[PDB]
Ligand binder design. Sequence first.
Ligand SMILES: OC[C@H]1O[C@@H](O)[C@H](O)[C@@H](O)[C@H]1O
Ligand SMILES: OC[C@H]1O[C@@H](O)[C@H](O)[C@@H](O)[C@H]1O
Ligand code: NA
Lengths: 339, 346
Amino acid sequence: SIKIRDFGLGSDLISLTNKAGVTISFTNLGARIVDWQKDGKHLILGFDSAKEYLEKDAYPGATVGPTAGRIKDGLVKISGKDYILNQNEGPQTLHGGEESIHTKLWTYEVTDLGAEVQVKFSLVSNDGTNGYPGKIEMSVTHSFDDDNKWKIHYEAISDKDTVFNPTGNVYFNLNGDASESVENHGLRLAASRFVPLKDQTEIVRGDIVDIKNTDLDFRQEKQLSNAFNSNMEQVQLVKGIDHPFLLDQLGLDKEQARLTLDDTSISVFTDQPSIVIFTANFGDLGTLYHEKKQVHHGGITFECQVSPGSEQIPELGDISLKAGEKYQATTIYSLHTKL
Amino acid sequence: SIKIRDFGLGSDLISLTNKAGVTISFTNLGARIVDWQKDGKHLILGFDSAKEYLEKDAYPGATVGPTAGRIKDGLVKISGKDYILNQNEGPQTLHGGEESIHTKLWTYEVTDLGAEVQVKFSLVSNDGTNGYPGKIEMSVTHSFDDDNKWKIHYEAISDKDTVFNPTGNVYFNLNGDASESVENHGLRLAASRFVPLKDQTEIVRGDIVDIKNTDLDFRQEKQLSNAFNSNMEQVQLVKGIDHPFLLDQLGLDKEQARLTLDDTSISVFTDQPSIVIFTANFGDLGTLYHEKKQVHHGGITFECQVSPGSEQIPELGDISLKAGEKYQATTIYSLHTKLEHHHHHH
Ligand SMILES: OC[C@H]1O[C@@H](O)[C@H](O)[C@@H](O)[C@H]1O
Ligand SMILES: OC[C@H]1O[C@@H](O)[C@H](O)[C@@H](O)[C@H]1O
Ligand code: NA
């Protein structure tokens, strides 16, 4: 079933219930996922109205871009030329700059295919918006099916050479309550290397490091508390995890990561080369979700994209988008329940 | 009463009915007016869904900007610096460039004051959008009261020195049918001068001309047919009117324009110095409005703003906006019945 309702400030909340009784909901404010629940438990973090996102934290569950992550000094080179993007975190451009696409109301259309329902959100980033060349016509389609698969497919076309590497910013918490750390979840992740951060500014350090046999090696399932209790300087630096992991084998058919808590597990599939993992290292901030005060480590992301820092480490990839070329990306989060 | 429902594509339709039974409606797609009816008759042009605006003509009834009108070659001078804006009509920048504010979904909040209801729409134009320095935090409040006044209040603040001069693009047609020409309406307009256009590109010619006693003189009420039938160079140039008229006396207190048909009148008040009048000179295009093919001259706008061309005719004004300075503008359209005797035949 599909239900559309007012979510506040003119935004809509679109809720989809599949044959299994699982409910997932989105909002056009930021082409974002708001909730995902089973047997009455939330599996992700989210708010109860549009105002909350705007007042508390506008990133959770949203589509972030045009470039996801931090860009050192807000600088990118396009066709050999230097362009300075909007700087909103000190001199860095984080998540596309201030007032970016996650804070805009996108238009959308719903398509019911029966076993699957799609919600296609669209937005135009005008040429020059926050320093980025354009215009870029973007669309993000979130879909949910009867097999409990939530898929995000992105597409974009630019009138001029530009940069483009968006991501989805859902935070999972299988405890179903923000006041509870995810340290009890088990994580598996098909990555043997990671990108260390330079310092507290969180820009990349410059190198690529092998994590095999370290506290960050999750090639074999392991509980998060391990990483959390590690003394690796990278863990200590951010007080948790806030880093890009390089996937060993690329392709949409491979389960790249798996998050498990008891009988409930989430599998991640993507066609992107990296997953940025951030464990809500918010200290005592205590943001409130559903009346529950969030705890440090009260959530975890799987941001699939090209690793941030390619401006300094080209080996990471190239986020250039040439005029007239069509950008495509796909990420899937699959829900499973043991029986 | 206030009612809200989906209008299509994620936009909503906000419908207000005042105590006199007059209803008016808006959409957050472009902070725009959709309809205004009295006794089951449409007083303005509009479509029945959001998609129609996007597929037929996205300007009607919209808030347009950041700069309304045409800027020659897209070039503006901001604090000694030259900036080139998005050019979407040949080398011209028309109504803020392509995919401008009229095409975005604005957020909104409704405030019920009893005798008055306000719908405040908000949007942020990011710095660099379409070449404009910003960011610019904008708000447009549309309000309707028990006295039949529809008021538009604009506010804006920029982080950077920029330019700002938006307007409202409503089109009236008191026939209530787009397929009926407005040449049968009577027009009174308190303006003695106008700004001629250079040519078909529609940029300003460079001079200001006195129109007293010509077919464009509406200081004293006359039927629109007088202008439409005129062979004056400017009218032939655009096949109707599409020009800025300079108000003779400024201030929100004065009735600057009055549009009448039979027993109904619309009066125009504004704090702006000019009114751009465009009479839907679309020829045979025939866009469908409520299944009626629109006729050439099937509509008339009263875009109140600083006249276009100040880039070339400094005397027209200055639309610059300094960083941190609060922009404000107010325009009001009021509806009356039996304000005067208007009984003609066409
Ligand atoms: O969503 C907010 C978070 O987003 C992550 O991508 C980022 O690395 C974190 O440091 C934090 O900013
Ligand atoms: O279609 C909207 C109209 O807006 C008027 O301001 C302009 O002068 C007309 O030529 C036309 O562009
Ligand atoms: Na809505």
